[PDB]
């Protein structure tokens, strides 16, 4: 209810998102024989958002994502004045989580952030499945837009109350089940940033893409909902 | 509440269903070592319906499926007058999503819609597990009927409110966990259609099957609920 | 509300349970490279109960399981007069689903119910992991008891309303994640029966075990809840 | 409402947690070809807490974990007077479940608790992925703190009612998806203890770590919530 509480909720939320989703990818996805694969990473990402949106969603709205904050602005749901502090809160929470993750991951012989990719988002030569820039662009635009659309709908005043964290968290699992092979799945500029920093090379070079594409997608989803679906 | 809103909700919903479920199948199911398999595809399909039914379900009823619209007509829940616009809305949303998916998938060297099947529904020689037409027929009839039955029950007036998108989305995950090996799992004529178009050959030839079988199953489920379980 | 509705809900429910859970095991669990494994079977089983308990739970109580009906009798929640019709309804629904499953499965070259086991519950030489009779006995007793305990608690008058189908369905997923290697996981005499019939040999010989053990476990869980946890 | 009921709920809860989560790990995680892997263990752990928190959460608060009881004390949510009986109840429930599990597991030829590890928590040479003590320390501190933070938030008075068992159970699945490779994932001193006893060697030697680290993390999460996020 006071902005210090809200920005703390948002850094904790984005922290948890980065630590849990990227942690699952770095520590467990590829573990020999028993590892969780892409489906387990998708689940982990979506569960970070589900659990935190229930935990701190009644404090801050529970965005944990710059593209979500901006998209909700665009959809007429969030004040332009509050946007920048949220985004900074998210970027900070994210970076702390990646630093801790980097520390933990380093306690294993042979760990190499730069060479492994550190769960970084890339396209072209740095796409996991060798998808071109155009494939990356279209998937991130659609998934960002739909994500915002689901966020708008599930938090609409005519939506039964309480269930939004479930709709929204599971939307993020969905989004990763589809798009990890294309881009390692972003839809979240703060998550891309936290991780790019420690990968240190190409992730930092391509980083601009995973800022503008999700934000543009998020605005589009907000606008479609606001203009086509809301009233009544 | 106005029919333009509703038909837009239904094309967005069916779009999301096609993009997410078939996207997960085309981009991620078979990915080397880390791919999501049939269980991840089943989950993705069911999550498209869960997330969209929460998002736009309070606008359109959230059918996203011709066999569901027709089945709810049969069960006395949906007006015959509204049926055709829903079905067209669903077929259109579906086809746009498949076109986008086709674009994304094409950004990978070696992609071949026709040869891979493009997540198309087939039986006999085009069943994934080599199941005969009779196996295809019985599974789609039962799963379509049960699906409609769950949709009817979970949206019954005596069902606790709010939870239907969860019951219904998870019913679709269930349905795919069972039947992907038989038919690649349809229960949805609009999803079969969107994808058949781009596969281009046998999917278009067998396409008639995945229209009539789900619709017949859906009507049967609506009738059983209406006639045997509703009153009271 | 009228007993014909209730017994129909219970046969449909138990049918769905058998068709979906055993169907997933027979058609999809072992599918080459992409199959769902034991985790996908566990999920499918639990989703049958979740989706049907939401669908028809407000009609019949949504037991779908003889050990649950008897256990709820023992826990003081269900009248002894209604028990036998429920159990028959469940056994009938179950057997129809197994017959349909048998038909579908037969549409694949090389299918052999008897040799594959047809998802039958066995111990000793017919345990999937080679577990002895004593291992089978202890796991089924504990899991049946806990299952009844969760059913009692989640449907207690002080439990927030609406959520029981989620608690109960996910309890069944849990129970299969643990015990498929020991017995192929029963906790449900009607599911064991439907499937034993078509396996035709040893499943029919060991069948007596998967009647008495779950029922005894279910009564124990009902009694613990009734006597130790209920009041207040 | 009476302390005998509450302590019984807590031993049953912790019992179920140990039996189900560690059972899934011992009986099913590594099963040839069809086994559940780390993702299935993570799911099983989280489902024990989800199902029991719905079942007995309205009786005892549904902690099932010493680090949760202590963390809720620290967060101003639970009386210091009730703490010790809860912790004993949890340790007892846990140990009974591990003993039963040990009995079941012994019914398979070649079973070796000591050599397999019996799902025990270890670091360094006894980490599953060869993670050092410092990696173990940082992951358990963060995950324990976040877990307490989610428990605090989801049970806050401004959180929609009913949903906490879902937020909290799925937080535990999350936590295991991340950290099984580092420590076999504890965040729960009673679960570590029950299992260490039967592993018999190094698990007992390292056991002190998985008491103090989770408890410290839990207190930290309680304090952050109490001091930074609660009011309003
Ligand atoms: Hg481009
Ligand atoms: Hg994406
Ligand atoms: Hg993300
Ligand atoms: Hg046929
Ligand atoms: Hg089907
Ligand atoms: Hg579908
Ligand atoms: Hg025995
Ligand atoms: Hg069992
Ligand atoms: Hg069962
Ligand atoms: Hg240390
Ligand atoms: Hg941990
Ligand atoms: Hg645990």
Curated annotation (Swiss-Prot), chains A, B, C, D:
One of its GO terms (molecular function) is identical protein binding. The chain crosses the membrane at residues 11-31, 36-56, 84-104, 133-153, 158-178, 204-224. Residues 3-10, 57-83, 154-157, 225-232 are cytoplasmic. A motif (NPA 1) lies at residues 65-67. It is found in: Cell inner membrane. This is Aquaporin Z. It catalyses: H2O(in) = H2O(out). Its main location: membrane. Keywords: Cell inner membrane, Cell membrane, Membrane, Repeat, Transmembrane, Transmembrane helix, Transport. It is a remarkably rigid tetramer that does not dissociate even when solubilized in SDS. Gene3D superfamilies: Glycerol uptake facilitator protein.
């Amino acid at each position: 209810s006071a902005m210090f509480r809200k920005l703390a909720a948002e850094s904790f939320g984005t922290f948890w998102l980065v630590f849990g989703g990227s942690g699952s990818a770095v520590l467990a996805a590829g573990f020999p024989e028993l590892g969780i694969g892409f489906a387990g990473v998708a689940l982990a990402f979506g569960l970070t958002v589900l659990t935190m949106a229930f935990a701190v969603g009644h404090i801050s709205g529970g965005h944990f994502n710059p593209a979500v904050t901006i998209g909700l602005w665009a959809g007429g749901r969030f004040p332009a004045k509050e946007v920048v502090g949220y985004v900074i809160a998210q970027v900070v929470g994210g970076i702390v989580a990646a630093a801790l993750l980097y520390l933990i991951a380093s306690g294993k012989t042979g760990f190499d952030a730069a060479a492994s990719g550190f769960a970084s988002n890339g396209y072209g030569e740095h796409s996991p499945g060798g998808y071109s820039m155009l494939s990356a662009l279209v998937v991130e635009l659609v998934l960002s837009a739909g994500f915002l659309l689901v966020i708008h709908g599930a938090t609409d005043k005519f939506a039964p109350a309480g269930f939004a964290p479930i709709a929204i968290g599971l939307a993020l699992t969905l989004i990763h089940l589809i798009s990890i092979p294309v881009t390692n799945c972003s839809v979240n500029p703060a998550r891309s940033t936290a991780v790019a920093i420690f990968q240190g090379g190409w992730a930092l070079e391509q980083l601009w893409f995973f800022w503008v594409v999700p934000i543009v997608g998020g605005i589009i989803g907000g606008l479609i909902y606001r203009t086509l679906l809301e009233k009544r």
